Amino acid sequence: VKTLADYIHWRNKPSSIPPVDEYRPPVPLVNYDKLSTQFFSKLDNDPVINRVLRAPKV
Amino acid sequence: MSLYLFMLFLQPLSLSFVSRSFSKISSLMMSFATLWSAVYMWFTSNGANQTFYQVVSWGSDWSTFGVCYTSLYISLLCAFIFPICVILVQGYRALSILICIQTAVSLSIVSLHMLAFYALFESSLLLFFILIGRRKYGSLSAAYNISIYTFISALGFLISAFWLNWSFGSVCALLPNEEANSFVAFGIFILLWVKAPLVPFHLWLPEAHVYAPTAGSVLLAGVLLKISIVGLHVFFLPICASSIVKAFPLILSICLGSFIFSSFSTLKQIDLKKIVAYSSISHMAIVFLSSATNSGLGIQGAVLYCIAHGLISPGLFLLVGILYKNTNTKLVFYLRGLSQQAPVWWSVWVFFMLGNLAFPLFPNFIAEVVCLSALFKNHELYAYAFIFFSFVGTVYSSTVLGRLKGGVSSQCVDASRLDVISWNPLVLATVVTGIGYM
Amino acid sequence: AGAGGPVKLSPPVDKPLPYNYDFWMDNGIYPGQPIYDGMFGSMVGNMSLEYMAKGWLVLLPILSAPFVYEHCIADDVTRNPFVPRQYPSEVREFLALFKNGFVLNDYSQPDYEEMKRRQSGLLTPIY
Amino acid sequence: ASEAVLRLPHKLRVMRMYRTGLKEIVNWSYGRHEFYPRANALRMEFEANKELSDREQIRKLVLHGEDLLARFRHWEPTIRSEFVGGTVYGVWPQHCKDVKFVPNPAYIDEFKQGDTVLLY
Amino acid sequence: MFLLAVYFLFFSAIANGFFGRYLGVRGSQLLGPSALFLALLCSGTIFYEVCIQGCSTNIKLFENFVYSNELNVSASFLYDPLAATMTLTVVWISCAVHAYQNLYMRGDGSQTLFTSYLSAFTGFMLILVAGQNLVMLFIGWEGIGVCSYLLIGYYGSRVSAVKSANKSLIVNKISDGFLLGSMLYLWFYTGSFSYCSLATFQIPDVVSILVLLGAIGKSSQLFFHVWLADAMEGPTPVSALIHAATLVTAGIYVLCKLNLHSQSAVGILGAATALMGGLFGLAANDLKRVIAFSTCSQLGYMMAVLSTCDDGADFAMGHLVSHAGFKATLFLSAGLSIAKENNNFLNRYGSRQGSPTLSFATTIASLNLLGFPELGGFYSKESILNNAYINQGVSIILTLATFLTAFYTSKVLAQLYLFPYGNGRQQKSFDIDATTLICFGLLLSEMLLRIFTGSSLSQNMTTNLPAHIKNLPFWVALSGALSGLATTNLFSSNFMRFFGNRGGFDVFYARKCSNVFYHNAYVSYTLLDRGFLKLY
Amino acid sequence: HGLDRDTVTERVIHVAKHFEKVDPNKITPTATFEELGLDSLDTVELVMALEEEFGLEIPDNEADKITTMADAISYVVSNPLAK
Amino acid sequence: DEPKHQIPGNALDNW
Amino acid sequence: NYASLKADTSMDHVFGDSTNKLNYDFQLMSSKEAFFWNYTLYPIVGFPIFLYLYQFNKLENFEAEIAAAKAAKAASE
Ligand SMILES: CCCCCCCCCCCCCCCCCC(=O)OC[C@H](COP(=O)([O-])OCC(O)COP(=O)([O-])OC[C@@H](COC(=O)CCCCCCCCCCCCCCCCC)OC(=O)CCCCCCCCCCCCCCCCC)OC(=O)CCCCCCCCCCCCCCCCC
Ligand SMILES: CCCCCCCCCCCCCCCCCC(=O)O[C@@H](COC(=O)CCCCCCCCCCCCCCC)COP(=O)(O)OCC[N+](C)(C)C
Ligand SMILES: CCCCCCCCCCCCCCCCCC(=O)O[C@@H](COC(=O)CCCCCCCCCCCCCCC)COP(=O)(O)OCC[N+](C)(C)C
Ligand SMILES: CCCCCCCCCCCCCCCCCCCC(=O)O[C@H](COC(=O)CCCCCCCCCCCCCC)COP(=O)(O)OCCN
Numbered sequence A: 001v002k003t004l005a006d007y008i009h010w011r012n013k014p015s016s017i018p019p020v021d022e023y024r025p026p027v028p029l030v031n032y033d034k035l036s037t038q039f040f041s042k043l044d045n046d047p048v049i050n051r052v053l054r055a056p057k058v
Numbered sequence B: 001m002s003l004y005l006f007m008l009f010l011q012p013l014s015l016s017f018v019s020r021s022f023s024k025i026s027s028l029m030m031s032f033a034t035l036w037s038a039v040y041m042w043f044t045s046n047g048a049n050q051t052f053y054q055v056v057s058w059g060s061d062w063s064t065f066g067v068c069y070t071s072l073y074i075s076l077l078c079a080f081i082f083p084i085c086v087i088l089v090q091g092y093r094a095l096s097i098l099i100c101i102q103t104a105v106s107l108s109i110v111s112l113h114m115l116a117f118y119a120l121f122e123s124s125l126l127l128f129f130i131l132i133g134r135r136k137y138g139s140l141s142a143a144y145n146i147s148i149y150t151f152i153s154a155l156g157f158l159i160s161a162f163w164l165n166w167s168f169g170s171v172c173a174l175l176p177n178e179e180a181n182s183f184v185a186f187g188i189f190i191l192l193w194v195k196a197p198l199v200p201f202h203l204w205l206p207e208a209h210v211y212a213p214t215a216g217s218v219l220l221a222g223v224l225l226k227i228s229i230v231g232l233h234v235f236f237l238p239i240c241a242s243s244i245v246k247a248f249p250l251i252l253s254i255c256l257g258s259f260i261f262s263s264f265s266t267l268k269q270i271d272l273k274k275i276v277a278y279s280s281i282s283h284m285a286i287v288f289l290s291s292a293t294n295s296g297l298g299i300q301g302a303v304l305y306c307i308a309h310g311l312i313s314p315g316l317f318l319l320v321g322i323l324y325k326n327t328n329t330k331l332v333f334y335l336r337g338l339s340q341q342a343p344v345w346w347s348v349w350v351f352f353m354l355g356n357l358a359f360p361l362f363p364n365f366i367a368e369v370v371c372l373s374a375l376f377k378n379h380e381l382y383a384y385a386f387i388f389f390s391f392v393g394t395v396y397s398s399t400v401l402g403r404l405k406g407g408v409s410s411q412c413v414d415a416s417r418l419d420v421i422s423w424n425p426l427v428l429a430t431v432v433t434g435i436g437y438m
Numbered sequence C: 001a002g003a004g005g006p007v008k009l010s011p012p013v014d015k016p017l018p019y020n021y022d023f024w025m026d027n028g029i030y031p032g033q034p035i036y037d038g039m040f041g042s043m044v045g046n047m048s049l050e051y052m053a054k055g056w057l058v059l060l061p062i063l064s065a066p067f068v069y070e071h072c073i074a075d076d077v078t079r080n081p082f083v084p085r086q087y088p089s090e091v092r093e094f095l096a097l098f099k100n101g102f103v104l105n106d107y108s109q110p111d112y113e114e115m116k117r118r119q120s121g122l123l124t125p126i127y
Numbered sequence D: 001a002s003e004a005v006l007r008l009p010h011k012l013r014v015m016r017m018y019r020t021g022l023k024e025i026v027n028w029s030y031g032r033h034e035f036y037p038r039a040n041a042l043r044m045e046f047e048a049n050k051e052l053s054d055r056e057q058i059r060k061l062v063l064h065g066e067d068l069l070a071r072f073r074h075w076e077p078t079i080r081s082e083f084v085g086g087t088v089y090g091v092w093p094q095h096c097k098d099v100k101f102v103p104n105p106a107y108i109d110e111f112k113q114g115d116t117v118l119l120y
Numbered sequence E: 001m002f003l004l005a006v007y008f009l010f011f012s013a014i015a016n017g018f019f020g021r022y023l024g025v026r027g028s029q030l031l032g033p034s035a036l037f038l039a040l041l042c043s044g045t046i047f048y049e050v051c052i053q054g055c056s057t058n059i060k061l062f063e064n065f066v067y068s069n070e071l072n073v074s075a076s077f078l079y080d081p082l083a084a085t086m087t088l089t090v091v092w093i094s095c096a097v098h099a100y101q102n103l104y105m106r107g108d109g110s111q112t113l114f115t116s117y118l119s120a121f122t123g124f125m126l127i128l129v130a131g132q133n134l135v136m137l138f139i140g141w142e143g144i145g146v147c148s149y150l151l152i153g154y155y156g157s158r159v160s161a162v163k164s165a166n167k168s169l170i171v172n173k174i175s176d177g178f179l180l181g182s183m184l185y186l187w188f189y190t191g192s193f194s195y196c197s198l199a200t201f202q203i204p205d206v207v208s209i210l211v212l213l214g215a216i217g218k219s220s221q222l223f224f225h226v227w228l229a230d231a232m233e234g235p236t237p238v239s240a241l242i243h244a245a246t247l248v249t250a251g252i253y254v255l256c257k258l259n260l261h262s263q264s265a266v267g268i269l270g271a272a273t274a275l276m277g278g279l280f281g282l283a284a285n286d287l288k289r290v291i292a293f294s295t296c297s298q299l300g301y302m303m304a305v306l307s308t309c310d311d312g313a314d315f316a317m318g319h320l321v322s323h324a325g326f327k328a329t330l331f332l333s334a335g336l337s338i339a340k341e342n343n344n345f346l347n348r349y350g351s352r353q354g355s356p357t358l359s360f361a362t363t364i365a366s367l368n369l370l371g372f373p374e375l376g377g378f379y380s381k382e383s384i385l386n387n388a389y390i391n392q393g394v395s396i397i398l399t400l401a402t403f404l405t406a407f408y409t410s411k412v413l414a415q416l417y418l419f420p421y422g423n424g425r426q427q428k429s430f431d432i433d434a435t436t437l438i439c440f441g442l443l444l445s446e447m448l449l450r451i452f453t454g455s456s457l458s459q460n461m462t463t464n465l466p467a468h469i470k471n472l473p474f475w476v477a478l479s480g481a482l483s484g485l486a487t488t489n490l491f492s493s494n495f496m497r498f499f500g501n502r503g504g505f506d507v508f509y510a511r512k513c514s515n516v517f518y519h520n521a522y523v524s525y526t527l528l529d530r531g532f533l534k535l536y
Numbered sequence F: 001h002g003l004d005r006d007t008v009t010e011r012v013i014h015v016a017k018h019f020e021k022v023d024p025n026k027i028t029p030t031a032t033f034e035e036l037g038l039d040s041l042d043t044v045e046l047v048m049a050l051e052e053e054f055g056l057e058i059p060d061n062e063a064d065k066i067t068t069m070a071d072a073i074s075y076v077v078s079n080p081l082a083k
Numbered sequence G: 001d002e003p004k005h006q007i008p009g010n011a012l013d014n015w
Numbered sequence H: 001n002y003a004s005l006k007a008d009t010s011m012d013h014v015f016g017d018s019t020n021k022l023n024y025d026f027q028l029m030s031s032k033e034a035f036f037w038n039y040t041l042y043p044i045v046g047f048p049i050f051l052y053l054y055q056f057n058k059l060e061n062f063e064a065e066i067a068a069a070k071a072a073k074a075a076s077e
């Protein structure tokens, strides 16, 4: 059965598709940026850190 | 009153007989004469006449004109703000359209007959379609929006006026009539719902303001939005109070929702004119709610806040127009370094933006205090809701100011002598109202 | 030299802009910043929200331990080794009126129950 | 480690790790006196594994040192004031010339200044 | 005579900021300090007349400032003992800051506008303090808020400064909104805005919460302290005024003027803010940041003392007035150190030949902060700590905050002077004029006078405490100072990092609150007005 | 201030002398670090010492490209903030 | 050149 | 006409290159997360509303209990 529903221009698909390539603003570079998600970690008491920071006589 | 009405009828008349080269000078002199006549009307208005200061009739119920507290303030505001619009507009066609719009609006405020009110306010329908849809700088979409919204709301108001004229036999405000009908109340209300932008019927306003000339935007925000409060105080609350009390939870929901959604929408705006337009929509909600409470504190507060908006919004729209003339841009992203490049424009912009945020030395503060007091008189939660959400206005205004304030700019874009002359009356009026001469 | 220092200018946009580019604040100087720092991009100290929450979870109990004892575990009689300051009857009656007063905790007084109910007053105005 | 660091060759990666570790030593120190022993300790830490040739062990060392340098990033980097990230960077930026100033703005076609309504 | 001070400050503001083209840089270097000196003479007269001789005066400028139906308020000034004391302190600090700005801001393009903003800022503070009704206080509250927005963001080409100003403005908007709600509650159920008729023995909890929420904004307490640390972007004279007197003190002043606070809340919030601020200041490496966290801690002490006893209001105001002098001195000295060294980091400071006056003023201000016995800071802080013993929870936290305060203060003093030179071998110099010496003379004079004249009437009244309990604050301060000199490690790297990130309040706001705010705005606009309801 | 080549050269030479391995006579205004005897780790330390000497901050990409005495002097001379 | 609305579909298919 | 799209590399040596770009995708919060945070934050914002509702409920319940007891006492007696 033909109905208005068939010929109404329903908004089911985007008329305009945004350009894929997008501008990313320049930012100062942080060499090491991995986020720390663990409050208690073995890294804090690492042997390297103890020798480099905790141990040297000051 | 008679002098004011005569000057109003003379201003459109004068254009027909001018030289076509003296048009701007004659129009400015006529605008100042209309302002002086409004001052005379204020002088001849005795406070002893508590109900209506002056009523004049010229042979029929339609030609019944009169001034009350709301009418007096709005008429003085229109006469004060029209000279600025006149100087900002160039060309006989533009002058003719503007002068006809002003005459129709100023006659509507003082009208005391619903049918005459409709006849005068809606006469300026094609003129706005033509003005907002001008050849190069106008948008047909905005013109269609404003025109259709106005026609539908005013037609509903007209149907309600026809029923009141049939049932009571008269539609003049001076004759005391009361109605409990909800269809008639809704008919009168829908006009107020659309004219004073209230969500979801506010879409027409921003489009019209953005694509209108600076004179048009100044007139629209300054006084066209206020015409709703005259209709409420003069043509709705006297007859349809019962329906406003019956629907108060719904009225409050729609007004608060308008205030919230408009504030949130203002945050996504990148055009200065759209920012000012959405600020106006947010500000209209408090006025509408305060008047709907049907209390002394609310009616006075709503009128006062309306005057404060009618003094602060034209200033922002004028500064935005001046900036656009200097730079041909309204995008906040392109405009930077305005503090260093335009110290004089920037000072006035910051002052007006502070006024828009309802700071104490501005009329907005006193007006807001009174309106909030009226809401608190109704319920404490009503006041709290409005007070809390006011921070959203701060966020958008602060972000805009910060983006405009600093950066790198290679263009000196500052106001000329003409631009300072145009805002000086608005600055002085803002200061005077701020110090308490409301 | 406070004035006249060299600055780097942000490069002009050269690619299609993202829809939500309004989240970036750029005045024309090279280091642009988000509207709110930490909303996106590099996080200060490389600490995520999860790390901060775990810290607050470790800290909160230690900070709350002093307050919970006196407020909840302790009682008016046992909180302090003395009674509240003693006043003449005329002064005491007026002072007892204040909800935020310090004379309402006098257990020795024969009006203790009324004073205690006064202290735990109404949440909101009844009218 | 960020993508830019990862793309770098082995030699440049280790040079970067040493540089960053020295900067982080500076940031976490309370005075210049602390820096010297800590910097010597960092030098010895890198020198100890410099002669390793096993690629797998080298990768493990690099990855671990990168995780350590990521966790121990300071909230407040010690940056000179005049450089990006500094207090006096941008305070009063030097104005470039070639500024476009319009002289006598209100006197250019003074009578006809305003907006016009053009019609068809 | 009482009006004169406000007149002098507003005149100096209008002159420097509207007629600076005529006056010149030198003209502002004259009119500013001259006006502030005249205002100091007036404030001294006011202090003697009101505080010492118990003569409160009311000056009504005009009536019917707001006259809508029943609601009626007038512009009136009541100089009560609290107003006189605060007026004096504010004007003394502002006069010193104006003298300081003559040399500090010479290298700044708008010295006329800076001086204008400083004088308008001082005028609005005096309006807030001296107002007789709640509306006048609101006028002052907003005026200081706007002046802070215009002063923190003075460097417009720095995105950090503009963001810091936006942050201040938004936080202060939320606080003044809660205040407006509380003022509406108080007007509705008491009939007036004047503090005389405002008195209510029993107030519903809602009004108390609204008052507290309003106060915690200006007096940066927990959850509302984000703006204070950021406010370091502004020039050093601004930081001295805001932190020492104009902004942080307003919240305490409001709480003390109208005693609607609840004991349970103020004590916990204060003690928490004291501890958190001290912990945040431990991690901080910027000189100006550490002094800001110290301000937060001291504010926590003042808020906490209100809960302890009836005299808590007097003790709080006494601490507030004692704190303004030393804290102002700390900021002005920090600014001079930064200017002389071109450095903001504690690591690069060290022993270097300088002016005796500045080094002494820094030492004495630090000692007052630390709690050194027989000093103005000591008496005002012991009055709080000794009287807080009754509240076991508040006392323990406040003692821990005293320890942390001593540790960071001693560490800062060691780093700035005792430590060897840490900056580079480059030519740096800032020569100090006689105006700066006058400014430090004024601050030292305030510090000395405070010892002789005292801060509260009940300052030396006996607190019936065992000797061991009365003298414990001293032992805790000494222990912290000794631990700070040794520059020992107190916390693990996980906690040091946590404290450096200030508890992650701002990371929470950015990730969750800001994202929710902009999603609500996206739904409100993109999805609805410009999506569903927009024609093709 | 645009610092002259002669001053920059003398100070870079002064800084380079501090390495124990380097012979005080091999360091010349135009000498590679390899000939001087510096390793990769040594080059990082030298660049950092240059950072202390002229009170500047060298971006890491440029610092990587510094490997000879000549290019360092050129870079410092080019920089307008070098002190 | 000015920004213009994207037309869905190919030219010849629409025609 | 339009501004130049060519950048200035004069200060690239002094202040670093512009090669490094932002990692943000420029997209907003997920719908599921937003629903939770809106329905969590908004109640916190409306703290007075809940206080008023609580007190009003307590008052009405007390009044109803009083009336019930009054009725009971007025029936037998
Ligand atoms: C006794 C002693 C003597 C003392 C004097 C006292 C005498 C009293 C009155 C005598 C004054 C003369 C009357 C003027 C007649 C001609 C006016 C005219 O043509 O207008 C444009 C004309 C400008 O001519 P133009 O620039 O040379 O070019 C026009 C070309 O012909 C064509 O140009 P175009 O093709 O490019 O068209 C462009 C068009 C853009 O296109 C449009 O916008 C079309 C829009 C349609 C109409 C607009 C709808 C809204 C109008 C609202 C009414 C305005 C007043 C608002 C007050 C509310 C009233 C309820 O823009 C315009 O034309 C102007 C825009 C605004 C003007 C519209 C107002 C005119 C309404 C009707 C005019 C009367 C004609 C009657 C014809 C008589 C025989 C043929 O005149 C004007 O200066 C502006 C209009 C002045 C309006 C006053 C006229 C009264 C109308 C109000 C109605 C109230 C009832 C009447 C009672 C009046 C008192 C008793
Ligand atoms: C580009 C600008 C360059 C030029 C700058 C201009 C400088 C302007 C100077 C600022 C003016 C400050 C004065 C504020 C008081 C306003 C004066 C006033 O309104 O006159 C009053 C008289 O009152 C006075 O004169 C006040 C004394 C003014 C000076 C006294 C001390 C000056 C210190 C300033 C502090 C004022 C705080 C007031 C805050 C509201 C009118 O008396 P009434 O008959 O009662 O009027 C009715 C009241 N109502 C307005 C509400 C309708
Ligand atoms: C209450 C009784 C007396 C009232 C006196 C109030 C004190 C003086 C008020 C003077 C007029 C009030 C508002 C002036 C216009 C607002 C603009 C402004 O204040 O500053 C302008 C420019 O300032 C002016 O030219 C006029 C200022 C003259 C005096 C201003 C004193 C401080 C303003 C008081 C705040 C108004 C209170 C409103 C709310 C209570 C913009 O400055 P910036 O955005 O910071 O940029 C400047 C460039 N730079 C980056 C280098 C900083
Ligand atoms: C017993 C009856 C039972 C119910 C039956 C209802 C059946 C239909 C009722 C609808 C009546 C509403 C009339 C408005 C129709 C919408 C506007 C037409 C859409 C449109 O395309 O207009 C274009 C611009 O309009 C615009 O830009 C306007 C935008 C939308 C206007 C918003 C409508 C006003 C507010 C709506 C309600 C407000 C309160 C309601 C009480 C101009 O198109 P074109 O000139 O290029 O022509 C070329 C042909 N396509």
Ligand SMILES: CCCCCCCCCCCCCCCCCCCC(=O)O[C@H](COC(=O)CCCCCCCCCCCCCC)COP(=O)(O)OCCN
Pocket: B156, B159, B160, B163, B182, B183, B184, B185, B186, B187, B188, B189, B243, B244, B247, B250, B251, B254
């Ligand atoms: C769903 C939320 C409602 C949206 C409105 C929100 C706020 C609007 C309030 C406006 C204030 C005054 C308007 C008076 C009533 C309008 C709407 C009130 C709510 C309503 O619809 O009540 C209905 C009665 O109203 C009526 O019978 C008339 C309804 C309006 C008619 C619609 C179009 C009329 C246009 C006529 C043009 C002029 C005609 C003049 C002859 C049914 O409520 P109920 O009492 O039956 O309760 C039975 C439920 N269990």
Ligand SMILES: CCCCCCCCCCCCCCCCCCCC(=O)O[C@H](COC(=O)CCCCCCCCCCCCCC)COP(=O)(O)OCCN
Pocket: C048, C049, C050, C052, C053, C054, C056, C057, C060, C063, E222, E272, E503, E504, E505, E508, E511
């Ligand atoms: C002394 C008085 C108290 C002062 C402050 C006390 C604050 C205590 C509240 C934190 C303690 C309970 C935290 C909830 C348990 C969560 C445990 C792990 C957290 C987690 O896994 O997800 C996080 C949720 O954020 C969150 O955890 C946010 C929940 C916080 C509730 C709101 C309370 C206000 C917090 C203000 C300061 C707290 C800062 C740190 C929370 C990060 O989520 P994600 O971004 O990684 O998700 C990915 C984006 N798709």
Ligand SMILES: CCCCCCCCCCCC(=O)SCCNC(=O)CCNC(=O)[C@H](O)C(C)(C)COP(=O)(O)O
Pocket: A048, A049, A052, A053, D010, D011, D014, D015, D017, D021, D024, D025, D028, D045, D046, D049, D050, D051, D052, D053, D058, D061, D062, D064, D065, D066, D068, D069, D072, F039, F040, F041, F042
């Ligand atoms: C604040 C806390 C401080 C943070 C400390 C964290 C730092 C982690 C320390 C541990 C990291 C390592 O060991 S990373 C060391 C990884 N080991 C290797 O790469 C072995 C192969 N060696 C080579 O390729 C070259 O010798 C080379 C080394 C490149 C030099 O080149 P030159 O021959 O030309 O000098």
